[PDB]
Structure formats: C-alpha cells, structure tokens
C-alpha cells in the first residue's frame, strides 16, 4: 500500500516572484485536463497484460 503520500512539486527559491503564478498555472492545468494528457502520453501505457 502507498505510504508517505507526498506529491511532486516545482521547487523555487523563497524569494522567487514566479511562485504565485507557477502554482496557479499548475492548478489550471489540473482542471483543464492538461495534466491528464501528460499522464496519457507518458504514464498510461500498461504495455502487456
């Protein structure tokens, strides 16, 4: 079973001006279904049985 459920993040320095816009551009891509496309073309293959 899964343990230590911590996601993948885009690290930046604490003084970065992009932190607000980067997170919003990730949440938008989650709702738009963009990150499900990146799942399809890269992660969801299933190859054999």
Partner 1 sequence: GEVVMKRAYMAVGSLTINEERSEVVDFSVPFIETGISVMVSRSNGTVSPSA
Partner 2 sequence: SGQADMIVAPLTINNERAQYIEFSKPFKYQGLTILVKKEIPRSTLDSFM
By CB under 8 A, name the binding residues for partner 2. 2-14, 16, 18-19, 22-23, 26-27, 29-30, 35
**How many residues interact with partner 1 (rule CB under 8 A)?**
7
**Phi/psi of residue 10, nearest 5 degrees:** -95, 105
How many residues can be counted in the chain? 49
Rounded CA separation 10/24 (Å)? 12
Q: Could you say which of partner 1, partner 2, none residue 18 binds, taking C-beta under 5 to 8 angstroms by partner kind?
A: partner 2
Is the Cβ–Cβ distance between 10 and 22 less than 8 Å? Answer: yes
Which one of the spans 11-19, 24-32, 38-46 is the region binding partner 1 (CB under 8 A)? Answer: 24-32
């Amino acid at each position: 079973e899964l343990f230590f459920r911590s996601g993948f993040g885009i690290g930046m320095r604490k003084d970065s001006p992009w932190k607000q816009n980067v997170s919003l551009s990730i949440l938008k891509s989650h709702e738009n279904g963009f990150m499900e496309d990146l799942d399809k073309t890269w992660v969801r293959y299933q190859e054999c049985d």
